[PDB]
Symmetry: D2
Amino acid sequence: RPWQILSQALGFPNYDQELWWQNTAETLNRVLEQCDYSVHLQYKYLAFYHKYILPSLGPFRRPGVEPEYISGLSHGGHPLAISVKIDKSKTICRLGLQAIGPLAGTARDPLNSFGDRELLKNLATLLPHVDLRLFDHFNAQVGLDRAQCAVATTKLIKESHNIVCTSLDLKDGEVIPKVYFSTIPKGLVTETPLFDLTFAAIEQMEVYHKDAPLRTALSSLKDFLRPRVPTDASITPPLTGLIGVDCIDPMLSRLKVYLATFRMDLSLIRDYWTLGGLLTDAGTMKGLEMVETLAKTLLPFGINYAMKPGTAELAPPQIYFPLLGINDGFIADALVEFFQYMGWEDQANRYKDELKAKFPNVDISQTKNVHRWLGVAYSETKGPSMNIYYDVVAGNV
Amino acid sequence: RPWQILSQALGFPNYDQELWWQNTAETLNRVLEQCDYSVHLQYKYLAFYHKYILPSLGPFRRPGVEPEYISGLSHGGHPLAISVKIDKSKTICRLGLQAIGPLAGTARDPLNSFGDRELLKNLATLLPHVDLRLFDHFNAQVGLDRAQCAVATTKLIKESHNIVCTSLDLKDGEVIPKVYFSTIPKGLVTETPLFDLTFAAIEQMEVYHKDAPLRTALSSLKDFLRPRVPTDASITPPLTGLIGVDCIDPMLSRLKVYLATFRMDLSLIRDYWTLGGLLTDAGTMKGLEMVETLAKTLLPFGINYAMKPGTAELAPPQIYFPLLGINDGFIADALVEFFQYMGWEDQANRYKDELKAKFPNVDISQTKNVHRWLGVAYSETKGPSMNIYYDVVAGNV
Amino acid sequence: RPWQILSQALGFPNYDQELWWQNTAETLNRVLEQCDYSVHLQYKYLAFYHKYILPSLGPFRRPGVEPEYISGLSHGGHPLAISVKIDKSKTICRLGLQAIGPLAGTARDPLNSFGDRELLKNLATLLPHVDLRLFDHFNAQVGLDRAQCAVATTKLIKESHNIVCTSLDLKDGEVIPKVYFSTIPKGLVTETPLFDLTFAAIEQMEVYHKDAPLRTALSSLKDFLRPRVPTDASITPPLTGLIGVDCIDPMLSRLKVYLATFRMDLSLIRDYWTLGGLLTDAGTMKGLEMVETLAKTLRLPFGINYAMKPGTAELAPPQIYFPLLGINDGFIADALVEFFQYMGWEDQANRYKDELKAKFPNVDISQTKNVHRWLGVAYSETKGPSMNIYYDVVAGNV
Amino acid sequence: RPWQILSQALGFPNYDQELWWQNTAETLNRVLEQCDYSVHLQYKYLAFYHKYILPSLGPFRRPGVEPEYISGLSHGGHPLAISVKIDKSKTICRLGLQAIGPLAGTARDPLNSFGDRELLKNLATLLPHVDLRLFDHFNAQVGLDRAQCAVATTKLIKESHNIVCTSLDLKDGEVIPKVYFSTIPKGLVTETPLFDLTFAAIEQMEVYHKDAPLRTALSSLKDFLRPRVPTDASITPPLTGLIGVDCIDPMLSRLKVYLATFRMDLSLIRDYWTLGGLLTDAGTMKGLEMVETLAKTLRLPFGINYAMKPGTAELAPPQIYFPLLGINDGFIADALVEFFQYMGWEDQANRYKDELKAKFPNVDISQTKNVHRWLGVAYSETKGPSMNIYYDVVAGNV
Ligand SMILES: COC(=O)[C@]1(Cc2ccc(O)cc2)OC(=O)C(O)=C1c1ccc(O)cc1
Ligand SMILES: COC(=O)[C@]1(Cc2ccc(O)cc2)OC(=O)C(O)=C1c1ccc(O)cc1
Ligand SMILES: CC(C)=CCC/C(C)=C/CSP(=O)(O)OP(=O)(O)O
Ligand SMILES: CC(C)=CCC/C(C)=C/CSP(=O)(O)OP(=O)(O)O
Ligand SMILES: CC(C)=CCC/C(C)=C/CSP(=O)(O)OP(=O)(O)O
Ligand SMILES: CC(C)=CCC/C(C)=C/CSP(=O)(O)OP(=O)(O)O
């Protein structure tokens, strides 16, 4: 009901917003039920979704209507994904989007440079613990003027006309925002190595100057990345495509460096997970078993090197496997095997039924688009985790 | 929580809307709890309140800030009241307002002629059973152009610069809108008897031409009213001040004619309740006992003659007693006596505690503003009812 | 330049408004120059267009993007027309549109029942002389609820999913709004003779009760129309399709009853122009010559508009509207020139064609058959003769 | 007339915008006429003002209505100023404001942290040459979170509850945005020398890393400033209060470091103008004469603005700003005239006073002490000499 009561109570300012609801709210409400969120938080997150996210989602692509802006975040072209973060004992719901501006994909705003900032400006008046300083920093570092954006669109596919995209964790009672920034556009227009802009942009952060542990960690990473990535201006995998940050106090925020690569295998998994033998402790290795097992039980691959200040030691990345094009029925079973392997019996026994329940307009045995990415993680304190990124819209036709 | 979760989830577009919430949402949420509305309807009605009513409420009058528009609906000047309709076994929650336009009280819109229509235009896209035909009819009949509105403001007190105000019943799962239209402005500017415009406006309704029962009832009423009210253009009590309609299919809607009067006593109660001996059956009389008892157990008085099509027989009115200036503690006790008298023991045992619970920022023993009006009613099928109109804001300082 | 300064100063809230301006504003500006509107009035009217009309125009239909709402006001489906009203000595510019609501053509608003009322509500705060009472009246008499609107859409072509459209006279420093209301939807849904509801709705106007001259004129018109139009619920020509009003003081507003009809010839022109021999004065007959001459000098219905002002019991000849959808605009240009000479309007004759080319320079008139859309003709006792020409701006800009 | 046509065409979304226009637009229009801006540019700039600036101005403070947010940019508390920049031969018009957000001065937005960024975001869709990278940079370096903003408000007068304000050059057909960022809030909250953060924030600019000339110029400036300003967290004169930038390509933008100071005299003028004997060329010294003469010809701080462009290692004399709040505007008019004669600007001298009266006709200049608010003076090698005069429009309209 909560999605229905809110539709009933709030209606819709235009038809596209209505279409968004009708293809994402039921699933979202479902996901929240399945994660054992309370009714009050179901309303909280859905009300929020309605007010702030619907308008940010732009037009709804569909037969007959072709937006000027087209997103990479999904197969149909829609700037939305819902993911979950699965733990031993709990599941968290997360939203991913690009906030579409009303002139995006036109001369006036080729790369959708404004809307994500506008969304967050609103979340800053809404939420008390939201912080725009890291955003503003990287936006300054990797943003482009109109003429530059225009150039960038002549050398990029329609799907990748973008500098920034946004995430929202529905964590505890809260909305935690995260933004990821693309270096590729600037790299292309300035003809600058991606490595160079990535670390130039990072080295100029306020946090960086005042936190020697971080500064150290970065060096470890630079030294490991330098040989593995291009030292010229090519877009040759593996590359430093994305920079990610949490929209909170800079000192407390994780700084994420992401690699994009098409070639993945056992040696490379190892190379990435351990940073070229740099990591060899028990945990690093227990986590390495995880990931190899997952790969055996089975768009670029993605390696995410996350870094928190007041900490000089790097840690294993999170590794992200593309699933686009692979049957969702098989994946459902795969993930169940792997959940059993991890000793997550509850998660194994419910995954597939619940998956069906998230996306009832579809038969997963015949779809290859709904599971889009999956990432895996190992932590010392928190231990293991899996993030699964779904294409809500694909799962709602 | 529901008022808090929605504040948390939705925030506020400007400060005035925030102030409205902080002085009306808690009370509203409370009232709904007390009427045994379900959580899903608590959210429904509160979400709706947030989206559509907050913006319509205009500025929030307060020390330091004096809106150009000032409402008659409340003591502080705020265009809002919450009322309840108390039955034998149940209670319904109702909202009353004027929808403030962004230029209201200025040259461009002296009488706030537009905002109520704009609100309802939105409720028409929201709700499927909302109907604007009766509105448009009476708005056409009693509305005024800019120059006329300007004139009307030079001959009316600041509190009465208005043609229309709106009501919303939170009934079952629904929002049922009602509008009341003021004849006084047109009467003043056109120097036309109020009686004449009131019935001229009524006689030109589509329903009227096609429904001989109604046409008959109206005649009974006209004949009864004609001697009791002014036949010239004065504003002399009793007068035909307000015309009211339900915003549904014209055939199904109750047409309400309201009298305003300052002189009330036992004979006049009788005169009004029975329409000058016209009504003498058992029910009319059982209802007459009710009302005399209520008056004994204790702004103009108000008499509301309601009329439905496909029905030629008039019925007793609903009579409305002003409470402004009378201690709310006394009234609380009064209403309890009268609830006991009616054999509504449950309602008697809870009124005062619940009243305190609606308005905890206040001590009712010392306030004379919170209970504002009270109306009483008798029906054949539905039987007896009491509507109590509160000044939420007054009850929230 | 004025259209370009305003584009420079205001930009656009979204792309559709940009497209609308890009296919629309140059022409509008040009038309104003050609009509000898001052620079300050050019800005006035273009600024107004930007703020108030662009947002009302909805999406801009175009390859790849198919709005949910499709308008009958133009060939491409765009809810916009620019017309002009030509006199002996002066020309004035007018705009015609439907104001598109954001849910128009969907379950929530099938017949676009709200947007025009919103636009006018905004003109009511803008302009001091705008009056919504007649609009509200006919919107009450002829408007439909959601469920009704839905029924109506299952019996009407996409192009006619509409109750009302709006017009705006750009007349001597001001914007005069007019609205036209369609009787068809309510006819279909209620299964009621169009005649009966047209006149029921008119017979309940406040004006009508307090103005016996009008009450009379109306009777004349009915007496003439009754035999000529269906007495049943059919939608058969000639029919009372549109009721029109000026959005000003009711006592000062013209009430307009429109007929649609496909069959037109010389006996019929005469019949409509004179109201069945009822009119025989010199002016009537000079007007008849005017009109007949126009028909001789030359798919959508013909339109007859019977206008009536209050405090007047005597009917007057209608204005007759000729459809030009499908006929070469190169010919029409030449046709209109002959007729301008014939009327003794040498200046208008010597300019028409060149100035037409100049309104619509992305197009060859010689090749197009959709730019000139209508043309109406009028005789008045005082003002004299008048030609209104309705263009399809968008059609003239692709 | 242009201000009146636009009011006629656009009306107003709410009353505050109306009031803003009614106390504001006549003057602006007049200033443009006096500066010989063409009619089309008058419309351009006034149309732009209507659409983009009015809504940004927030409520209009006035008897009975007390906004939650109170601005330091004017005497009445209104966040608006019109300035003018006077040359030998031409004058240009500029606007200064804070863009007021709808929760500004409340828990949710104590320091008005968002509205200027929103305004610029809208200018970025409007104008092609607007660039937000420097803005974003300093907003990152010098901006504060909600809790921080709250702390800052408990140590600052209502009038200074602000991080940023905005300016707009109406220069040869375009709108050039500039923003100024206040270092004080972050100083107070972090308890950090203003000097240290001013230069930390500057030392992290992208430009700075890739431009050794700038890196150098900056060093010169620091070397001069270091001894002259506090080395502790105090807010004591002279202080590095404002960092300014032009919202264009970083490589092309002037970085401006402002000093505030209450003590000014002839040794100090010299000291600031030359940077402690560091500058001794002919131009420097002719500028010094210019300035000294101005001080001789004559409560808010004095302002020194050190501007620096990239690809330039050599500093240049600042522009010095004299507060005029409290001093009769009748005198100032006469004062400015002397000085115009002294500069050899006869035309500017012969017009100033009359044209001033003409900007502000609801007022007697003779009687007012708040309309002229600041005046800054400048010497350039190429452009030459320059006077910027900052007016309080609202103060000149009540
Ligand atoms: C005779 O033509 C018309 O009245 C209309 C509407 C109109 C009216 C006035 C005006 O200045 C511009 C357009 O002009 C059109 O292009 C067009 O399609 C009109 C119209 C209106 C209603 C209708 O049933 C058919 C056409
Ligand atoms: C020297 O004066 C100024 O820069 C300001 C801001 C300003 C800047 C440019 C412009 O065209 C108009 C106003 O003009 C004012 O009226 C005013 O109050 C300004 C200002 C800015 C910041 C500050 O700390 C004090 C004043
Ligand atoms: C570069 C490629 C191909 C994929 C990266 C995918 C991506 C942006 C993952 C973010 S996971 P994230 O939302 O950040 O989850 P947590 O940090 O909380 O573990
Ligand atoms: C004219 C005076 C003084 C008071 C009238 C008060 C008023 C507008 C009452 C409406 S009661 P109402 O909301 O209409 O309740 P029901 O018809 O459902 O019984
Ligand atoms: C029903 C058909 C086919 C045509 C009617 C066309 C119509 C609504 C024309 C507008 S009449 P109008 O613009 O109002 O012209 P004027 O009376 O101002 O001279
Ligand atoms: C800190 C104090 C007291 C004054 C500084 C005043 C200030 C911000 C003036 C604007 S400088 P600006 O408008 O940018 O003038 P130009 O450099 O364009 O000649």
